[PDB]
Every structure is written in C-alpha cells, then in structure tokens.
C-alpha cells in the first residue's frame, strides 16, 4: 500500500492556483500525499496535477467520485491517469460494471482505484448508508484494495474495516471541519483526509503539525 | 427548456478538433449539447465557452455531481463560471447535497438536472431500488429537471408519473445502449444521444436519420 507520511492526506480544495500552491507548499514537510478534487481541477485545469508533481514530492489522488456508466467511466479514468494522477476515487453506488470499468483502466495503466463506500455528510444516511456494506463487499469481490469511509461515523468506519479486512487500504474524510476525531478515526483508517481544518487556518503548517502531534503515538 | 428536435448531443469525443468538427456537422439539427468529463478533462473547461461562441448552443454540464454539500457548491460555482447553462447532479448522495447545487444554480441563473435512475446494467444493483424515492425527494426539493433511462421505458414512465407533466425530463441510453428514440419520447421531453451520432461514419446523416424516425413527435 502507498506509504502516506504521517497518515495525513491533504484535501486541497482551494480554487485559486496561487493559494492552493502556497498552502500545499507550507505543509509539504508534513504531508507527501495530496487529494486533488474537482473544486481545484475545474478551476485551474488538469495541468494542476502536473504543477503539483513538479513543485512538490507528493503522490496525487484524484478525487473525482467517478459515477457514470462503464463507457464514460473508462474515459474519465484514462484522462485522469494520463494527466499524472497516481490514483482515482470511484463511487460504488452505480454498480459493479461501473467499478470494473475503472479497475480495468487502472490495471492497464498501472495506477490505483479507491472505492468510496459510505460518505461522511448527513445526506449519506438517506440512500448510501443502507447500501454501504454491500458496496464494500462488492469491492472485495471485485478485487478492490483501496477504500474510502467516513470519519464522522466511527461505528460505520469500523464495520467497513471489518468487511474489507486488515490488508486493504482505507482512507477517511470528515475529521476536523465535519466533526470527526483524528485519533478515533485512525483506529480503523490507515490515513485521514483533512481539508478545511488545514487550508483555512491562519497557519496551515501549524494546523497540520497540531493534528500530527495529537496522533503522534499512532 | 426548449430543445430543438427533442435531441441533445452527448459530445463525449476527447479531442477538441473532432468534438468541434462533429458538433459543427450536426449543428443544424440541435441547439443543446451535453458536455461531460471525457471532453472537459481532456481539453479544459474553456471548451464550454468555445462551444457557445461557435454554436451559441445551450450547454448542459454532465458532471454527475456526487460529493458532500460544501464540495458540491464549489463544483457548481466553477462549472457555471465556465458558462454552463445547467448541471447534472446525482440524487443518491442525499437531499443536502442536491440542495447545495440548487442554491448555486439559483444564484447564477442556471438549472439543476436530477439524475434519478441510470441506464446501464449496474444501475439495477443500488440505484434502481432508490430511484422512486430519489424522484420524490426531487419533487419535495422543488427540482424541475430530471434524467431517467431510455433503456428501461417502464422505469422512465414511472419517473414521469412521479414528477408530473410539468417537469422537464431528458433521457440517455437511446441508440448505442439499446434504447429506442421514439419509445423514449413517449415519456421524456428530449433524448440524449452520443455514440450513435459522434461515432457514425456520417454524424450528420445519423442525426438526420434519428430525427426522421421521430418526425411525428
Ligand atoms: O464521504 C466523503 C468523501 C469525500 O471524498 N469527502 C471529501 O473530503 C474532503 C473533506 O474536506 P474537509 O476536511 O471537510 O474540509 C473534501 O474534499 C470532500 O469532497 C468528504 O468530505 N466526504
Ligand atoms: O444513466 C445515465 C446518465 C447519463 O448521463 N448517461 C450519459 O449519457 C451519454 C450516453 O451516450 P451514448 O448515446 O450511450 O453514447 C453519456 O455521456 C453518458 O455518460 C448515460 O449514458 N446514462
């Protein structure tokens, strides 16, 4: 599995190139894995992945929550990996064929797929939560090795970890701004994803260092 | 929304030159183009403005928005800043995530299309069972534009029943995926067509043929 420095992944959702680069650079000594999503990509272009690689020694996880039909999913994954992303996050709710399409491209292109099971926001309780365990089991059956689960619901994150097993890689968003606790989350997840708590802080570096200090024993 | 010939072109070619050329070849048959991530991630968001400058067509950004409320808001803002007239959002992530999109759309004078049930086989695993409820959620939220499957006319009909005749419904799956244009238009206001047109030996002839088959509609 990828070796995530300090078990901390930066969710860089600033939409300004200058600010995104500044903040990422300031926390560079604490994080070597950055999650880049659509807020930044749709604002600055896919070349932002190239710029981050050039400026920082960081792995890039493209958080595109791929959720289309198989044919379109394949195209999205191809374009994303072509741009330099190490991995891509895919939704499991659209079904097995849609996930398989992503896995096939990742396999042929030498990259990785992360399967998003349950989400961290309140709305996730309406439809996603009830299908989450099955989505996770589907991922295991499909050979998925990387997963995403909610920091906001430790009880659910714990069950997801059981389903996927100790060998699978699990990252989790929701700590900080959304209310999740870093320490408790790391009891189940290999790494935590943190965005606003860091990038909106007066001193992002101090914020990142503070989070790391609170989980030093882990 | 007034869609010319009840036909929306799904421009999923991933090369700017080909995308512009093919769209130009069928421009006389359409005035609404659906641009998704295959083209946007390959050529950039500036492609949307290029389409509006060259064709003056309506642009529906098919981004299957499916994130938390906060991120959904940012995605919608970036998308409308690029000139998209509407955006397609997944309903599966819940009401709060859809509301986030509705708010930005209202603020920028755009429309949100709620994707209920999808057209591919995998949609039967989790989406189909929640589709009716997702549609009712749309009604409760005041959503007026929806997306339903051409590949399952019975499901498309049910969606139409739930949202009513006043709501706008567009439907993908006609052609390549097996759906029938005419049958789909019994329930949807407009059909989305991609490969059957953009992968045809003669895109213009393909579009003309589809329109000829639904002439009475
Ligand atoms: O269930 C999920 C999945 C996900 O990727 N995310 C993403 O994780 C990040 C969370 O950031 P933040 O720490 O709440 O600011 C954002 O980029 C979200 O889009 C989430 O919050 N919940
Ligand atoms: O359920 C759905 C939703 C959707 O947007 N789409 C999109 O509609 C288009 C269908 O294209 P095609 O006519 O099968 O080539 C693609 O851009 C898909 O991503 C779909 O096929 N099924």
């Amino acid at each position: 599995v990828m070796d995530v420095m300090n078990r901390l992944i930066l969710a860089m959702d600033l939409m300004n190139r200058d600010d995104a680069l500044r903040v990422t650079g300031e926390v560079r000594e604490y994080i070597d894995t950055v999650k880049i999503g659509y807020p930044l990509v749709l604002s600055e272009g896919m070349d932002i992945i190239a710029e981050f690689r050039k400026r920082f020694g960081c792995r890039i996880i493209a958080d595109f929550k791929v959720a289309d039909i198989p044919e379109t999913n394949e195209k999205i994954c191809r374009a994303t990996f072509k741009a330099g992303a190490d991995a891509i996050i895919v939704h499991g709710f659209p079904g097995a064929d849609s996930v398989r399409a992503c896995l096939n491209v990742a396999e042929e292109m030498g990259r990785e797929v992360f399967l998003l099971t349950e989400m961290s926001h309140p709305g996730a309780e309406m439809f996603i939560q009830g299908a989450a365990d099955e989505i996770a089991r589907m991922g295991v059956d499909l050979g998925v090795k990387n997963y995403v689960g909610p920091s906001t619901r430790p009880e659910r994150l714990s069950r997801l970890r059981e389903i996927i097993g100790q060998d699978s890689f699990l990252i989790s968003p929701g700590a900080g701004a959304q209310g999740g606790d870093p320490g408790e989350t790391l009891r189940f997840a290999d790494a935590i994803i943190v965005g606003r708590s860091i990038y909106l802080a007066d001193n992002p570096a101090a914020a990142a260092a503070g989070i790391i200090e609170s989980i030093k024993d882990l």
Side-chain angles (χ1 to χ4, degrees), chain A:
Chain A
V1 302
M2 54 169 67
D3 175 45
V4 178
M5 184 177 283
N6 291 314
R7 306 180 69 182
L8 179 62
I9 298 174
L10 175 68
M12 181 35 64
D13 299 309
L14 285 176
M15 304 168 80
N16 175 290
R17 199 186 202 74
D18 298 309
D19 297 327
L21 292 169
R22 183 191 70 255
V23 175
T24 302
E26 298 184 333
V27 303
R28 195 173 186 294
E29 68 185 354
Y30 301 109
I31 306 171
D32 71 356
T33 306
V34 179
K35 185 177 74 64
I36 292 181
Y38 283 136
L40 180 54
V41 164
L42 298 181
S43 295
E44 297 294 347
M46 286 295 275
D47 277 0
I48 194 65
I49 293 174
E51 181 159 38
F52 269 57
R53 285 297 297 178
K54 180 179 179 180
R55 297 197 56 174
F56 321 116
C58 69
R59 302 191 190 75
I60 298 298
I61 296 174
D63 184 7
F64 294 173
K65 292 183 181 58
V66 188
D68 218 301
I69 65 172
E71 294 55 55
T72 295
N73 277 12
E74 282 192 48
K75 296 174 184 174
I76 293 173
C77 292
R78 290 183 179 294
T80 300
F81 295 140
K82 178 176 181 179
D86 292 287
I88 193 172
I89 301 176
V90 179
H91 259 298
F93 78 79
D97 55 355
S98 287
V99 176
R100 185 177 299 86
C102 298
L103 293 174
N104 294 326
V105 176
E107 179 59 50
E108 72 174 70
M109 301 188 76
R111 304 296 164 76
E112 289 272 62
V113 164
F114 275 72
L115 181 66
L116 175 55
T117 59
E118 186 170 321
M119 288 181 74
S120 66
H121 65 299
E125 292 180 356
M126 290 185 70
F127 306 110
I128 295 176
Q129 190 173 73
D133 289 351
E134 196 181 325
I135 288 175
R137 193 164 70 257
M138 170 187 77
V140 176
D141 185 64
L142 293 177
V144 174
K145 303 185 299 177
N146 309 295
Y147 300 81
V148 185
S151 167
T152 52
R153 305 196 190 84
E155 72 274 31
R156 293 294 302 136
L157 190 63
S158 175
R159 180 56 190 147
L160 272 349
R161 164 57 76 186
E162 300 183 333
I163 295 172
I164 67 179
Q166 298 289 65
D167 288 356
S168 295
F169 195 62
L170 175 60
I171 63 178
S172 179
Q178 295 180 59
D181 180 69
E184 297 306 302
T185 301
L186 289 176
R187 292 182 299 171
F188 312 113
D190 289 284
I192 52 174
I193 293 163
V194 181
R196 288 166 289 170
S197 288
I198 291 173
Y199 73 69
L200 289 184
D202 287 334
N203 186 335
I211 291 169
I212 294 175
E213 184 70 301
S214 69
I215 61 176
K216 187 177 182 60
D217 290 358
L218 304 178

